[PDB]
Scaffold this active site. Structure first.
Site, PDB file in Angstrom:
ATOM      1  N   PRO A 126       0.792  -1.239   0.000  1.00  0.00           N
ATOM      2  CA  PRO A 126       0.000   0.000   0.000  1.00  0.00           C
ATOM      3  C   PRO A 126       0.824   1.289   0.000  1.00  0.00           C
ATOM      4  O   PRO A 126       1.876   1.354   0.630  1.00  0.00           O
ATOM      5  CB  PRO A 126      -0.852  -0.128   1.275  1.00  0.00           C
ATOM      6  CG  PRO A 126      -0.056  -1.077   2.155  1.00  0.00           C
ATOM      7  CD  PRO A 126       0.546  -2.075   1.189  1.00  0.00           C
ATOM      8  N   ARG A 132       0.285   7.681  -0.513  1.00  0.00           N
ATOM      9  CA  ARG A 132       0.648   8.996  -1.031  1.00  0.00           C
ATOM     10  C   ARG A 132      -0.618   9.800  -1.317  1.00  0.00           C
ATOM     11  O   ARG A 132      -0.704  10.972  -0.953  1.00  0.00           O
ATOM     12  CB  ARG A 132       1.551   8.914  -2.269  1.00  0.00           C
ATOM     13  CG  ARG A 132       3.044   8.969  -1.969  1.00  0.00           C
ATOM     14  CD  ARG A 132       3.939   9.066  -3.200  1.00  0.00           C
ATOM     15  NE  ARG A 132       3.963   7.862  -4.025  1.00  0.00           N
ATOM     16  CZ  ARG A 132       4.574   7.751  -5.206  1.00  0.00           C
ATOM     17  NH1 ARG A 132       5.235   8.775  -5.722  1.00  0.00           N
ATOM     18  NH2 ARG A 132       4.525   6.609  -5.869  1.00  0.00           N
ATOM     19  N   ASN A 166      10.891   3.175   2.219  1.00  0.00           N
ATOM     20  CA  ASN A 166       9.949   2.076   2.358  1.00  0.00           C
ATOM     21  C   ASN A 166      10.350   1.197   3.534  1.00  0.00           C
ATOM     22  O   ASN A 166      11.516   1.140   3.892  1.00  0.00           O
ATOM     23  CB  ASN A 166       9.908   1.196   1.108  1.00  0.00           C
ATOM     24  CG  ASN A 166       9.444   1.952  -0.118  1.00  0.00           C
ATOM     25  OD1 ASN A 166       8.936   3.066  -0.013  1.00  0.00           O
ATOM     26  ND2 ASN A 166       9.636   1.343  -1.272  1.00  0.00           N
ATOM     27  N   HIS A 185      13.503   5.246   6.811  1.00  0.00           N
ATOM     28  CA  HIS A 185      12.285   5.288   7.610  1.00  0.00           C
ATOM     29  C   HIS A 185      12.123   3.990   8.398  1.00  0.00           C
ATOM     30  O   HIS A 185      11.007   3.637   8.783  1.00  0.00           O
ATOM     31  CB  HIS A 185      11.086   5.629   6.720  1.00  0.00           C
ATOM     32  CG  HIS A 185      11.146   6.992   6.109  1.00  0.00           C
ATOM     33  ND1 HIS A 185      10.336   7.362   5.042  1.00  0.00           N
ATOM     34  CD2 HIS A 185      11.900   8.074   6.401  1.00  0.00           C
ATOM     35  CE1 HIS A 185      10.588   8.615   4.719  1.00  0.00           C
ATOM     36  NE2 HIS A 185      11.541   9.068   5.538  1.00  0.00           N
TER      37      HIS A 185
HETATM   38  C1  LIG Z   1       7.249   7.114   6.337  1.00  0.00           C
HETATM   39  S1  LIG Z   1       7.075   7.793   4.926  1.00  0.00           S
HETATM   40  N1  LIG Z   1       7.218   5.788   6.459  1.00  0.00           N
HETATM   41  C2  LIG Z   1       7.069   5.073   7.719  1.00  0.00           C
HETATM   42  C3  LIG Z   1       5.699   5.324   8.356  1.00  0.00           C
HETATM   43  C4  LIG Z   1       5.392   4.307   9.448  1.00  0.00           C
HETATM   44  C5  LIG Z   1       3.921   3.892   9.432  1.00  0.00           C
HETATM   45  C6  LIG Z   1       3.712   2.735   8.456  1.00  0.00           C
HETATM   46  C7  LIG Z   1       2.254   2.314   8.354  1.00  0.00           C
HETATM   47  C8  LIG Z   1       2.136   0.829   8.041  1.00  0.00           C
HETATM   48  C9  LIG Z   1       0.686   0.380   8.177  1.00  0.00           C
HETATM   49  C10 LIG Z   1       0.328  -0.679   7.142  1.00  0.00           C
HETATM   50  C11 LIG Z   1       0.998  -1.997   7.497  1.00  0.00           C
HETATM   51  C12 LIG Z   1       1.156  -2.915   6.294  1.00  0.00           C
HETATM   52  C13 LIG Z   1       2.033  -4.091   6.682  1.00  0.00           C
END
Ligand SMILES: *C(=S)NCCCCCCCCCCCC
Ligand SMILES: [Zn+2]
Length: 281
Positions: free
Chosen positions: A39, A42, A109, A128
């Protein structure tokens, strides 16, 4: 100076094939993983309603996660990918590694697909963070857990906790509001000194301080953007000299570049083999 003979994917390919292009840095985001079924976020909301967030973006913010971790892990369950198969774009970066051209891949990612494609720790700046490891949030402790352990907790819908200290266990991901990892700054200090090309793929450079990486390269270093949209960069002014934008899906763009470089067959074989392996697991 101007090193490109032409402000096009073809001009970039001719430069890459030349003796001048020795060190390449890749800057990558969500767009390199979308075809792997990862997913994006953006530009997606309805799913979130049931959690009753103060605002949608709160689910990726550290302050809220601390106070209420339940939404995040439930969203991780619901959106968790069935398989982890890297894309053509990941495998193109593997080819740069194999061909001694990849100095570093800086990634926004957290899906681990770079590692799965065979980039090593040394090749990567996970700007990240990552799901590959998780840690207890207590300083005096910091028990580490692998992904195997992490997903099992996500699926069972019970918040992951350290047994030793009872505190929460967080995937080693950088939420908004969290400062970036030390490695990002240590690598950025020297990687950009002698870099011959930036390949910016699948990011609109919307997130700081990751987006500031593009300005660290020498003024002469060409920069190719492969992305759904244009995103420091001067592609179109009467002074444009070194930045090229190719608009489309990352897999299509990497396929196009590989074809220009004569790597198409090599790339296709690699993807086929690696996907077959994953399918067999
Ligand atoms: C910043 S641009 N990236 C890191 C953000 C941390 C939050 C990630 C959300 C993941 C939720 C969906 C999980 C799918 C395995
Ligand atoms: Zn602990």
């Amino acid at each position: 100076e101007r090193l490109l003979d032409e402000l096009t994917l073809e001009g970039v390919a001719r430069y890459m094939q030349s003796e001048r292009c020795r060190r390449v840095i890749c800057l990558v985001g969500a767009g390199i993983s979308t075809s792997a079924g990862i997913p994006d976020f953006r530009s997606p909301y309805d799913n979130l309603e049931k959690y009753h967030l103060p605002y949608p973006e709160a689910i990726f913010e550290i302050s809220y996660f601390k106070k209420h971790p339940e939404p995040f892990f439930a969203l991780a369950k619901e959106l968790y990918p069935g398989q982890f198969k890297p894309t053509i774009c990941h495998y193109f970066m593997r080819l740069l590694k194999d061909k001694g051209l990849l100095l570093r891949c800086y990634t926004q990612n957290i899906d681990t697909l770079e590692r799965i494609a065979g980039l090593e720790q040394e090749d990567l700046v996970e700007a990240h963070g990552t799901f590959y490891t998780s840690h207890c949030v207590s300083a005096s402790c910091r028990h580490e857990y692998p992904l195997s352990w992490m997903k099992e907790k996500i699926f069972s819908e019970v918040t992951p906790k350290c047994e030793d200290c009872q505190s929460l266990v967080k995937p080693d991901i950088v939420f908004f509001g969290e400062s970036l990892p030390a490695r990002f700054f240590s690598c950025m200090q020297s990687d950009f000194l002698k870099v011959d090309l930036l390949l910016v793929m699948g990011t609109s450079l919307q997130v700081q301080p990751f987006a500031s990486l593009i300005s660290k390269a020498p003024l002469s270093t060409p920069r190719l953007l492969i992305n759904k949209e244009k995103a420091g960069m001067d592609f179109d002014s009467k002074k444009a000299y070194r930045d090229v934008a190719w608009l489309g899906e990352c897999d299509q763009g990497c396929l196009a570049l590989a074809e220009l470089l004569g790597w198409k067959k090599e790339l296709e074989d690699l993807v086929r083999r690696e996907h077959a392996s994953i399918d067999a697991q």
